[PDB]
Amino acid sequence: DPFTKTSLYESTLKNQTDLLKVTQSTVEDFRSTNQSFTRALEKDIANLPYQSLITEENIINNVGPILKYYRHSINALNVYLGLNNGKVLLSQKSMPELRDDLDIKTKDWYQEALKTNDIFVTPAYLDTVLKQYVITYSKAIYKDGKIIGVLGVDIPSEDLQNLVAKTPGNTFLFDQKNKIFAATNKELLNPSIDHSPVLNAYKLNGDNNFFSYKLNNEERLGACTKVFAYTACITESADIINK
Ligand SMILES: N[C@@H](Cc1ccccc1)C(=O)O
Ligand SMILES: [Cl-]
């Protein structure tokens, strides 16, 4: 009876929407926690006297311990401060050293931090120091309007993947390039899987709008929404309304 089918559709739409939102919140909370951490670190560095900032040896001895404590506190992969002379004070998982051989001005995390007064968040990429995929939070640190350097904080992208995977629902994230990034169902990360139907249904319907689509001649229901540069989606079988 159409009344009963409508009731099932509305119920499942509510559940799946709710679960999509949980995945959205997971991504949001991950980012905001790492931004707050980065901002705190910025503040602690900039609150040092200038004397503690204006020689490289003072950077090593005064900023180094701060990088290291902060790194430990959140279990970050790397925490670093890059200077306009090309040197970088690097605290890496494994005494922070001032490294001259790391080409920092070619890095997006460095370049882009100088172009905004906000924290800059990179897409995930392979860290060259420890060769893990990371999300980098970078921030140009200023004291009295004077640049000190660019702070960077590397968090393993696996951390976010793991958080998403734990969420209820058949939820998943695409990155910026509409490549699959995270999923509750590990099998969805099989890289040969096409996601055109979901993506095309999302493009036709827009954020948070529940849609029907087909997989192997069978009906499925889903919704997607933008979360930062990611696309979060949920999908389920349509059996709940049909059977
Ligand atoms: N994850 C950073 C690590 C790094 C810091 C400082 C200099 C060089 C590299 C990167 O790969 O760019
Ligand atoms: Cl993030």
Side-chain angles (χ1 to χ4, degrees), residues 160-185 187-224:
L160 177 56
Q161 295 167 322
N162 289 340
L163 282 161
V164 169
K166 284 181 168 192
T167 63
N170 183 45
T171 59
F172 47 102
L173 287 188
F174 296 94
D175 64 20
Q176 297 77 17
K177 286 161 60 133
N178 287 334
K179 189 180 170 175
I180 195 79
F181 177 80
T184 291
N185 187 333
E187 293 182 45
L188 269 181
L189 313 165
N190 180 334
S192 294
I193 296 177
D194 172 57
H195 310 270
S196 284
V198 170
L199 286 163
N200 277 333
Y202 166 52
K203 178 61 186 297
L204 188 56
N205 285 278
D207 281 344
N208 291 318
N209 294 328
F210 206 57
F211 55 71
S212 58
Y213 72 99
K214 290 190 203 173
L215 174 69
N216 193 37
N217 195 39
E218 296 297 307
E219 191 178 4
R220 290 186 68 75
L221 304 171
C224 299

Short mmCIF file of all heavy atoms in Angstrom, two decimals, residues 160-224, unseen atoms left out:
data_model
loop_
_atom_site.label_atom_id
_atom_site.label_comp_id
_atom_site.label_asym_id
_atom_site.label_seq_id
_atom_site.Cartn_x
_atom_site.Cartn_y
_atom_site.Cartn_z
N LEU A 160 42.42 9.41 9.99
CA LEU A 160 41.08 9.81 9.53
C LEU A 160 40.39 8.61 8.87
O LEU A 160 39.19 8.39 9.06
CB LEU A 160 41.15 10.97 8.55
CG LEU A 160 39.82 11.43 7.95
CD1 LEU A 160 38.81 11.80 9.05
CD2 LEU A 160 40.05 12.59 7.00
N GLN A 161 41.13 7.85 8.06
CA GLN A 161 40.53 6.66 7.41
C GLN A 161 39.95 5.74 8.45
O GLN A 161 38.83 5.22 8.28
CB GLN A 161 41.56 5.95 6.50
CG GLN A 161 41.98 6.83 5.33
CD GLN A 161 43.20 6.34 4.57
OE1 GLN A 161 44.14 5.83 5.14
NE2 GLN A 161 43.17 6.53 3.27
N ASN A 162 40.70 5.48 9.51
CA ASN A 162 40.28 4.58 10.59
C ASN A 162 39.06 5.11 11.29
O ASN A 162 38.14 4.35 11.60
CB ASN A 162 41.41 4.31 11.60
CG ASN A 162 42.51 3.44 11.04
OD1 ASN A 162 42.31 2.74 10.05
ND2 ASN A 162 43.70 3.48 11.67
N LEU A 163 39.01 6.41 11.57
CA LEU A 163 37.84 7.00 12.20
C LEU A 163 36.59 6.85 11.35
O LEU A 163 35.53 6.48 11.84
CB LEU A 163 38.05 8.49 12.49
CG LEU A 163 38.89 8.80 13.70
CD1 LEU A 163 39.44 10.21 13.66
CD2 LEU A 163 38.11 8.62 14.97
N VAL A 164 36.69 7.12 10.04
CA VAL A 164 35.56 6.97 9.15
C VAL A 164 35.11 5.50 9.11
O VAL A 164 33.90 5.21 9.10
CB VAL A 164 35.87 7.54 7.77
CG1 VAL A 164 34.81 7.15 6.75
CG2 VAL A 164 36.09 9.06 7.85
N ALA A 165 36.06 4.58 9.04
CA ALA A 165 35.75 3.19 8.90
C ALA A 165 34.94 2.66 10.06
O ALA A 165 34.10 1.82 9.86
CB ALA A 165 37.02 2.37 8.74
N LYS A 166 35.14 3.21 11.27
CA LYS A 166 34.47 2.82 12.49
C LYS A 166 33.03 3.29 12.58
O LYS A 166 32.26 2.77 13.42
CB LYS A 166 35.25 3.23 13.75
CG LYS A 166 36.45 2.39 14.05
CD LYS A 166 37.18 2.81 15.32
CE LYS A 166 38.20 1.78 15.75
NZ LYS A 166 38.69 2.06 17.14
N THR A 167 32.63 4.24 11.73
CA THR A 167 31.32 4.85 11.83
C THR A 167 30.26 3.83 11.42
O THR A 167 30.52 2.95 10.60
CB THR A 167 31.19 6.09 10.95
OG1 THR A 167 31.33 5.74 9.57
CG2 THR A 167 32.13 7.22 11.38
N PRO A 168 29.06 3.95 11.99
CA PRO A 168 27.96 3.14 11.50
C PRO A 168 27.61 3.47 10.06
O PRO A 168 27.94 4.54 9.55
CB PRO A 168 26.80 3.49 12.43
CG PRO A 168 27.16 4.90 12.88
CD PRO A 168 28.64 4.93 12.99
N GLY A 169 26.91 2.57 9.40
CA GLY A 169 26.46 2.82 8.07
C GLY A 169 27.49 2.51 7.01
O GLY A 169 28.70 2.60 7.20
N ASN A 170 26.99 2.28 5.81
CA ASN A 170 27.81 2.05 4.64
C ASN A 170 28.27 3.38 4.07
O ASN A 170 27.81 3.81 3.02
CB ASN A 170 27.10 1.20 3.60
CG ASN A 170 27.98 0.90 2.41
OD1 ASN A 170 29.15 0.54 2.58
ND2 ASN A 170 27.46 1.07 1.20
N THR A 171 29.13 4.04 4.82
CA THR A 171 29.57 5.40 4.51
C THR A 171 31.00 5.36 3.99
O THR A 171 31.77 4.44 4.26
CB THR A 171 29.49 6.35 5.72
OG1 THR A 171 30.30 5.85 6.78
CG2 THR A 171 28.10 6.52 6.18
N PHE A 172 31.32 6.37 3.19
CA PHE A 172 32.63 6.40 2.54
C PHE A 172 32.93 7.83 2.10
O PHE A 172 32.02 8.66 2.00
CB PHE A 172 32.76 5.38 1.38
CG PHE A 172 31.60 5.35 0.42
CD1 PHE A 172 31.67 5.96 -0.84
CD2 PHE A 172 30.44 4.64 0.74
CE1 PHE A 172 30.64 5.84 -1.77
CE2 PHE A 172 29.42 4.57 -0.17
CZ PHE A 172 29.50 5.16 -1.42
N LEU A 173 34.21 8.09 1.86
CA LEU A 173 34.67 9.44 1.49
C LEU A 173 35.43 9.33 0.18
O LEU A 173 36.25 8.42 0.03
CB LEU A 173 35.66 10.02 2.49
CG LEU A 173 35.29 10.51 3.84
CD1 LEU A 173 36.52 11.18 4.42
CD2 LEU A 173 34.15 11.50 3.70
N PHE A 174 35.18 10.28 -0.71
CA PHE A 174 36.01 10.54 -1.87
C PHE A 174 36.88 11.77 -1.56
O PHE A 174 36.40 12.74 -0.98
CB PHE A 174 35.16 10.86 -3.10
CG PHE A 174 34.30 9.72 -3.55
CD1 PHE A 174 32.98 9.61 -3.12
CD2 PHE A 174 34.79 8.76 -4.40
CE1 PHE A 174 32.18 8.59 -3.57
CE2 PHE A 174 33.99 7.70 -4.83
CZ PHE A 174 32.66 7.64 -4.44
N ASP A 175 38.09 11.78 -2.12
CA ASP A 175 38.94 12.97 -2.05
C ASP A 175 38.57 13.96 -3.12
O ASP A 175 37.57 13.84 -3.82
CB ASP A 175 40.44 12.61 -2.06
CG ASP A 175 40.89 11.94 -3.37
OD1 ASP A 175 40.20 12.10 -4.38
OD2 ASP A 175 41.92 11.24 -3.36
N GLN A 176 39.37 14.96 -3.16
CA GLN A 176 39.27 16.06 -4.09
C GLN A 176 39.14 15.62 -5.56
O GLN A 176 38.54 16.31 -6.40
CB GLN A 176 40.57 16.87 -3.88
CG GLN A 176 40.70 17.48 -2.48
CD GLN A 176 41.11 16.57 -1.29
OE1 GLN A 176 41.61 15.49 -1.41
NE2 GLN A 176 40.93 17.12 -0.11
N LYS A 177 39.83 14.57 -5.92
CA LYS A 177 39.89 14.08 -7.29
C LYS A 177 38.82 13.00 -7.55
O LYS A 177 38.94 12.24 -8.50
CB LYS A 177 41.28 13.50 -7.56
CG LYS A 177 42.39 14.54 -7.72
CD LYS A 177 43.78 13.95 -7.51
CE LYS A 177 44.09 12.84 -8.50
NZ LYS A 177 45.44 13.00 -9.11
N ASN A 178 37.83 12.90 -6.66
CA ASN A 178 36.75 11.89 -6.70
C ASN A 178 37.29 10.46 -6.69
O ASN A 178 36.70 9.55 -7.27
CB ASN A 178 35.80 12.11 -7.88
CG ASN A 178 34.89 13.30 -7.69
OD1 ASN A 178 34.60 13.69 -6.56
ND2 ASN A 178 34.40 13.86 -8.78
N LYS A 179 38.42 10.28 -6.04
CA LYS A 179 38.99 8.95 -5.74
C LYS A 179 38.61 8.56 -4.32
O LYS A 179 38.60 9.38 -3.40
CB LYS A 179 40.51 9.03 -5.86
CG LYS A 179 41.24 7.70 -5.80
CD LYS A 179 42.76 7.88 -5.92
CE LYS A 179 43.47 6.56 -5.61
NZ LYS A 179 44.93 6.60 -5.81
N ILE A 180 38.25 7.30 -4.17
CA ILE A 180 37.91 6.73 -2.90
C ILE A 180 39.04 6.80 -1.89
O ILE A 180 40.19 6.70 -2.27
CB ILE A 180 37.48 5.28 -3.07
CG1 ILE A 180 36.80 4.82 -1.80
CG2 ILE A 180 38.64 4.37 -3.42
CD1 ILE A 180 35.36 5.31 -1.70
N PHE A 181 38.75 7.31 -0.72
CA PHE A 181 39.71 7.66 0.32
C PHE A 181 39.53 6.87 1.62
O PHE A 181 40.51 6.44 2.26
CB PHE A 181 39.58 9.16 0.59
CG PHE A 181 40.46 9.67 1.68
CD1 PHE A 181 41.80 9.93 1.45
CD2 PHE A 181 39.94 9.91 2.93
CE1 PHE A 181 42.60 10.37 2.47
CE2 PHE A 181 40.73 10.40 3.94
CZ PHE A 181 42.06 10.65 3.70
N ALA A 182 38.27 6.72 2.03
CA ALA A 182 37.95 6.03 3.25
C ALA A 182 36.60 5.33 3.14
O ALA A 182 35.76 5.77 2.38
CB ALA A 182 37.97 6.99 4.44
N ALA A 183 36.41 4.24 3.88
CA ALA A 183 35.15 3.48 3.79
C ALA A 183 34.99 2.58 4.99
O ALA A 183 35.95 1.99 5.45
CB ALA A 183 35.12 2.63 2.53
N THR A 184 33.76 2.42 5.45
CA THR A 184 33.44 1.43 6.44
C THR A 184 33.65 0.01 5.93
O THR A 184 34.18 -0.82 6.66
CB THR A 184 31.99 1.64 6.92
OG1 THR A 184 31.92 2.86 7.67
CG2 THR A 184 31.56 0.52 7.80
N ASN A 185 33.28 -0.24 4.69
CA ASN A 185 33.46 -1.53 4.09
C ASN A 185 34.79 -1.45 3.36
O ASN A 185 34.87 -0.81 2.31
CB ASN A 185 32.34 -1.90 3.11
CG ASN A 185 32.46 -3.34 2.63
OD1 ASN A 185 33.56 -3.91 2.58
ND2 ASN A 185 31.34 -3.96 2.35
N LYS A 186 35.77 -2.21 3.87
CA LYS A 186 37.13 -2.16 3.36
C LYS A 186 37.17 -2.57 1.89
O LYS A 186 38.07 -2.17 1.17
CB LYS A 186 38.06 -3.08 4.18
N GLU A 187 36.20 -3.37 1.46
CA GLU A 187 36.22 -3.88 0.09
C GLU A 187 36.01 -2.70 -0.87
O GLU A 187 36.52 -2.73 -1.99
CB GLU A 187 35.12 -4.91 -0.13
CG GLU A 187 35.28 -6.22 0.62
CD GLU A 187 34.16 -7.18 0.27
OE1 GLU A 187 33.85 -7.31 -0.94
OE2 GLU A 187 33.53 -7.73 1.20
N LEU A 188 35.31 -1.64 -0.43
CA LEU A 188 35.04 -0.51 -1.32
C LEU A 188 36.30 0.20 -1.76
O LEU A 188 36.24 1.10 -2.60
CB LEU A 188 34.18 0.54 -0.65
CG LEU A 188 32.69 0.36 -0.86
CD1 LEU A 188 32.01 1.52 -0.15
CD2 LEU A 188 32.32 0.30 -2.34
N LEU A 189 37.40 -0.05 -1.06
CA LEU A 189 38.64 0.55 -1.50
C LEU A 189 39.32 -0.21 -2.68
O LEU A 189 40.34 0.23 -3.18
CB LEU A 189 39.58 0.70 -0.31
CG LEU A 189 39.00 1.29 0.98
CD1 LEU A 189 39.95 1.03 2.13
CD2 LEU A 189 38.72 2.78 0.84
N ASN A 190 38.71 -1.29 -3.18
CA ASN A 190 39.24 -1.98 -4.37
C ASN A 190 39.27 -0.91 -5.47
O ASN A 190 38.26 -0.32 -5.79
CB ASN A 190 38.32 -3.19 -4.73
CG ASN A 190 38.78 -3.97 -5.96
OD1 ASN A 190 39.44 -3.43 -6.82
ND2 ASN A 190 38.32 -5.22 -6.10
N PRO A 191 40.45 -0.60 -6.02
CA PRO A 191 40.66 0.62 -6.82
C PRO A 191 40.04 0.53 -8.22
O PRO A 191 39.85 1.55 -8.90
CB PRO A 191 42.19 0.70 -6.92
CG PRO A 191 42.63 -0.74 -6.85
CD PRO A 191 41.67 -1.40 -5.89
N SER A 192 39.65 -0.68 -8.61
CA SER A 192 38.99 -0.90 -9.89
C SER A 192 37.48 -0.74 -9.83
O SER A 192 36.80 -0.91 -10.84
CB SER A 192 39.28 -2.32 -10.36
OG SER A 192 40.64 -2.41 -10.63
N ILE A 193 36.95 -0.41 -8.65
CA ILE A 193 35.52 -0.22 -8.55
C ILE A 193 35.13 1.12 -9.19
O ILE A 193 35.75 2.15 -8.95
CB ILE A 193 35.06 -0.28 -7.08
CG1 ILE A 193 35.31 -1.68 -6.48
CG2 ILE A 193 33.60 0.11 -6.99
CD1 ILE A 193 34.94 -1.77 -5.02
N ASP A 194 34.15 1.10 -10.07
CA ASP A 194 33.63 2.36 -10.60
C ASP A 194 32.62 2.96 -9.62
O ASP A 194 31.73 2.26 -9.18
CB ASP A 194 32.96 2.10 -11.95
CG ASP A 194 32.23 3.31 -12.48
OD1 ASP A 194 32.87 4.38 -12.66
OD2 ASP A 194 31.04 3.18 -12.79
N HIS A 195 32.68 4.27 -9.38
CA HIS A 195 31.67 4.96 -8.60
C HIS A 195 30.83 6.01 -9.37
O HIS A 195 30.16 6.89 -8.78
CB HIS A 195 32.33 5.52 -7.33
CG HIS A 195 33.16 4.52 -6.57
ND1 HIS A 195 32.64 3.73 -5.57
CD2 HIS A 195 34.49 4.24 -6.62
CE1 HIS A 195 33.61 3.03 -5.01
NE2 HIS A 195 34.74 3.28 -5.66
N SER A 196 30.79 5.87 -10.69
CA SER A 196 30.06 6.81 -11.55
C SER A 196 28.57 6.95 -11.20
O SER A 196 28.05 8.07 -11.14
CB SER A 196 30.23 6.43 -13.03
OG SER A 196 31.52 6.82 -13.44
N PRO A 197 27.88 5.85 -10.92
CA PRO A 197 26.47 5.95 -10.65
C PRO A 197 26.16 6.76 -9.42
O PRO A 197 25.27 7.63 -9.44
CB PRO A 197 26.06 4.46 -10.47
CG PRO A 197 27.06 3.73 -11.27
CD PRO A 197 28.32 4.45 -10.97
N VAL A 198 26.88 6.50 -8.33
CA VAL A 198 26.67 7.27 -7.11
C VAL A 198 27.05 8.71 -7.41
O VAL A 198 26.28 9.62 -7.12
CB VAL A 198 27.47 6.71 -5.91
CG1 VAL A 198 27.42 7.66 -4.72
CG2 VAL A 198 26.93 5.34 -5.52
N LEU A 199 28.23 8.92 -8.00
CA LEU A 199 28.72 10.28 -8.22
C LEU A 199 27.78 11.07 -9.13
O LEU A 199 27.49 12.25 -8.90
CB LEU A 199 30.16 10.32 -8.75
CG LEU A 199 31.21 9.99 -7.68
CD1 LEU A 199 32.52 9.64 -8.36
CD2 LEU A 199 31.37 11.10 -6.67
N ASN A 200 27.32 10.42 -10.20
CA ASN A 200 26.37 11.06 -11.11
C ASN A 200 25.02 11.33 -10.45
O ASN A 200 24.43 12.38 -10.67
CB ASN A 200 26.16 10.19 -12.35
CG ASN A 200 27.24 10.40 -13.39
OD1 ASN A 200 27.86 11.47 -13.48
ND2 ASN A 200 27.47 9.38 -14.20
N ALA A 201 24.57 10.41 -9.61
CA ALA A 201 23.34 10.66 -8.85
C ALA A 201 23.53 11.82 -7.88
O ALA A 201 22.68 12.70 -7.79
CB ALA A 201 22.89 9.40 -8.11
N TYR A 202 24.71 11.90 -7.25
CA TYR A 202 25.00 13.03 -6.36
C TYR A 202 25.01 14.35 -7.14
O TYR A 202 24.35 15.32 -6.73
CB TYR A 202 26.33 12.82 -5.64
CG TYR A 202 26.88 14.05 -4.96
CD1 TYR A 202 26.10 14.77 -4.09
CD2 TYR A 202 28.18 14.52 -5.23
CE1 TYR A 202 26.60 15.85 -3.40
CE2 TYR A 202 28.68 15.65 -4.60
CZ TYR A 202 27.87 16.33 -3.71
OH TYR A 202 28.29 17.46 -3.05
N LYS A 203 25.61 14.35 -8.32
CA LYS A 203 25.69 15.57 -9.11
C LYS A 203 24.31 16.02 -9.59
O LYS A 203 23.98 17.20 -9.56
CB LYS A 203 26.64 15.38 -10.30
CG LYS A 203 26.75 16.60 -11.22
CD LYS A 203 27.29 17.82 -10.48
CE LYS A 203 27.29 19.08 -11.34
NZ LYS A 203 28.17 18.96 -12.53
N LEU A 204 23.46 15.06 -9.90
CA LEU A 204 22.08 15.33 -10.29
C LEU A 204 21.22 15.86 -9.14
O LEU A 204 20.26 16.59 -9.38
CB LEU A 204 21.47 14.06 -10.86
CG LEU A 204 20.09 14.07 -11.51
CD1 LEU A 204 20.00 15.07 -12.65
CD2 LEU A 204 19.79 12.65 -12.00
N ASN A 205 21.51 15.40 -7.91
CA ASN A 205 20.63 15.64 -6.74
C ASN A 205 21.13 16.66 -5.71
O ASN A 205 20.32 17.29 -5.03
CB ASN A 205 20.37 14.32 -6.01
CG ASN A 205 19.38 13.45 -6.76
OD1 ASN A 205 18.18 13.65 -6.64
ND2 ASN A 205 19.88 12.56 -7.63
N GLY A 206 22.44 16.82 -5.56
CA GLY A 206 22.99 17.78 -4.59
C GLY A 206 23.12 17.29 -3.16
O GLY A 206 22.76 16.14 -2.82
N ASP A 207 23.65 18.16 -2.31
CA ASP A 207 24.09 17.79 -0.96
C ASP A 207 22.89 17.31 -0.16
O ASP A 207 21.87 18.00 -0.07
CB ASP A 207 24.68 19.00 -0.23
CG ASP A 207 26.08 19.31 -0.65
OD1 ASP A 207 26.73 18.47 -1.27
OD2 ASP A 207 26.53 20.42 -0.30
N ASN A 208 23.07 16.15 0.47
CA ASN A 208 22.15 15.62 1.45
C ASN A 208 20.79 15.22 0.88
O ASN A 208 19.88 14.94 1.63
CB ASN A 208 21.96 16.63 2.60
CG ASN A 208 23.19 16.79 3.43
OD1 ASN A 208 23.88 15.82 3.75
ND2 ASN A 208 23.58 18.02 3.63
N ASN A 209 20.69 15.12 -0.44
CA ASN A 209 19.44 14.76 -1.09
C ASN A 209 19.46 13.28 -1.44
O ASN A 209 20.21 12.85 -2.28
CB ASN A 209 19.19 15.67 -2.29
CG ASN A 209 18.97 17.12 -1.87
OD1 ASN A 209 18.43 17.37 -0.79
ND2 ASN A 209 19.47 18.06 -2.66
N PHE A 210 18.57 12.52 -0.81
CA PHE A 210 18.47 11.07 -0.95
C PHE A 210 18.02 10.76 -2.37
O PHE A 210 17.09 11.37 -2.86
CB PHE A 210 17.43 10.59 0.06
CG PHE A 210 17.59 9.16 0.51
CD1 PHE A 210 18.78 8.71 1.09
CD2 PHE A 210 16.51 8.30 0.49
CE1 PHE A 210 18.86 7.41 1.57
CE2 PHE A 210 16.61 7.01 0.95
CZ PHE A 210 17.76 6.57 1.55
N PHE A 211 18.66 9.77 -2.97
CA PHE A 211 18.42 9.38 -4.35
C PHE A 211 18.36 7.85 -4.51
O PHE A 211 18.79 7.12 -3.61
CB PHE A 211 19.45 9.99 -5.29
CG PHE A 211 20.89 9.69 -4.92
CD1 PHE A 211 21.45 8.43 -5.07
CD2 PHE A 211 21.71 10.71 -4.51
CE1 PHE A 211 22.78 8.19 -4.76
CE2 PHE A 211 23.01 10.45 -4.13
CZ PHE A 211 23.57 9.20 -4.25
N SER A 212 17.80 7.41 -5.63
CA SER A 212 17.78 6.01 -6.02
C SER A 212 18.75 5.88 -7.19
O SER A 212 18.92 6.80 -7.97
CB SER A 212 16.37 5.53 -6.43
OG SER A 212 15.92 6.32 -7.46
N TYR A 213 19.38 4.73 -7.27
CA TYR A 213 20.21 4.37 -8.39
C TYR A 213 20.25 2.84 -8.51
O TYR A 213 19.75 2.13 -7.66
CB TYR A 213 21.61 4.97 -8.23
CG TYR A 213 22.48 4.34 -7.18
CD1 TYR A 213 23.46 3.41 -7.51
CD2 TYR A 213 22.35 4.66 -5.84
CE1 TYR A 213 24.25 2.80 -6.54
CE2 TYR A 213 23.14 4.05 -4.87
CZ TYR A 213 24.12 3.16 -5.21
OH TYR A 213 24.89 2.53 -4.27
N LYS A 214 20.89 2.36 -9.57
CA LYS A 214 20.93 0.94 -9.86
C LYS A 214 22.34 0.37 -9.73
O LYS A 214 23.31 1.02 -10.06
CB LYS A 214 20.37 0.64 -11.24
CG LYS A 214 18.88 0.86 -11.33
CD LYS A 214 18.33 0.32 -12.64
CE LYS A 214 17.02 0.99 -12.99
NZ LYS A 214 16.63 0.56 -14.36
N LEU A 215 22.41 -0.87 -9.25
CA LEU A 215 23.62 -1.70 -9.25
C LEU A 215 23.20 -3.15 -9.57
O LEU A 215 22.37 -3.73 -8.89
CB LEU A 215 24.29 -1.65 -7.87
CG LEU A 215 25.49 -2.58 -7.68
CD1 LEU A 215 26.72 -2.14 -8.49
CD2 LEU A 215 25.87 -2.74 -6.20
N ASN A 216 23.66 -3.66 -10.69
CA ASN A 216 23.31 -5.03 -11.16
C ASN A 216 21.78 -5.24 -11.29
O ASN A 216 21.25 -6.29 -10.87
CB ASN A 216 23.95 -6.07 -10.22
CG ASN A 216 23.93 -7.48 -10.77
OD1 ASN A 216 24.10 -7.67 -11.98
ND2 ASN A 216 23.87 -8.47 -9.88
N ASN A 217 21.08 -4.21 -11.78
CA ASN A 217 19.65 -4.27 -12.11
C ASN A 217 18.80 -4.20 -10.84
O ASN A 217 17.58 -4.30 -10.91
CB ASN A 217 19.32 -5.55 -12.92
CG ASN A 217 17.95 -5.48 -13.59
OD1 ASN A 217 17.52 -4.43 -14.09
ND2 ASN A 217 17.26 -6.62 -13.61
N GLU A 218 19.46 -3.96 -9.71
CA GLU A 218 18.81 -3.84 -8.41
C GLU A 218 18.85 -2.40 -7.91
O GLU A 218 19.79 -1.67 -8.19
CB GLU A 218 19.46 -4.78 -7.39
CG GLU A 218 19.27 -6.26 -7.76
CD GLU A 218 17.80 -6.67 -7.76
OE1 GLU A 218 17.17 -6.41 -6.71
OE2 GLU A 218 17.34 -7.30 -8.63
N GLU A 219 17.80 -1.99 -7.19
CA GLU A 219 17.65 -0.63 -6.73
C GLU A 219 18.49 -0.42 -5.46
O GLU A 219 18.38 -1.18 -4.50
CB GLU A 219 16.19 -0.23 -6.44
CG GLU A 219 16.00 1.27 -6.21
CD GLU A 219 14.57 1.71 -5.96
OE1 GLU A 219 13.67 0.84 -5.88
OE2 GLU A 219 14.36 2.93 -5.78
N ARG A 220 19.15 0.73 -5.37
CA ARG A 220 19.81 1.14 -4.16
C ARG A 220 19.44 2.60 -3.89
O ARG A 220 18.94 3.30 -4.78
CB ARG A 220 21.32 1.01 -4.35
CG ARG A 220 21.83 -0.42 -4.41
CD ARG A 220 23.34 -0.49 -4.45
NE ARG A 220 23.98 -0.07 -3.20
CZ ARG A 220 24.03 -0.79 -2.08
NH1 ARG A 220 23.48 -2.01 -2.02
NH2 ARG A 220 24.61 -0.31 -0.98
N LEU A 221 19.68 3.04 -2.67
CA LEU A 221 19.32 4.36 -2.19
C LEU A 221 20.61 4.94 -1.59
O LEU A 221 21.40 4.25 -0.96
CB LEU A 221 18.23 4.27 -1.09
CG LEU A 221 16.94 3.54 -1.47
CD1 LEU A 221 16.05 3.34 -0.25
CD2 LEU A 221 16.22 4.39 -2.48
N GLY A 222 20.78 6.24 -1.73
CA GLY A 222 21.92 6.86 -1.15
C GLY A 222 21.84 8.36 -1.09
O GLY A 222 20.89 8.95 -1.57
N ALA A 223 22.89 8.97 -0.51
CA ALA A 223 23.01 10.40 -0.45
C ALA A 223 24.47 10.73 -0.29
O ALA A 223 25.22 9.94 0.29
CB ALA A 223 22.27 10.96 0.74
N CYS A 224 24.88 11.91 -0.76
CA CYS A 224 26.24 12.36 -0.58
C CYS A 224 26.17 13.81 -0.16
O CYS A 224 25.19 14.49 -0.45
CB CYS A 224 27.04 12.25 -1.87
SG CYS A 224 27.21 10.61 -2.54
#
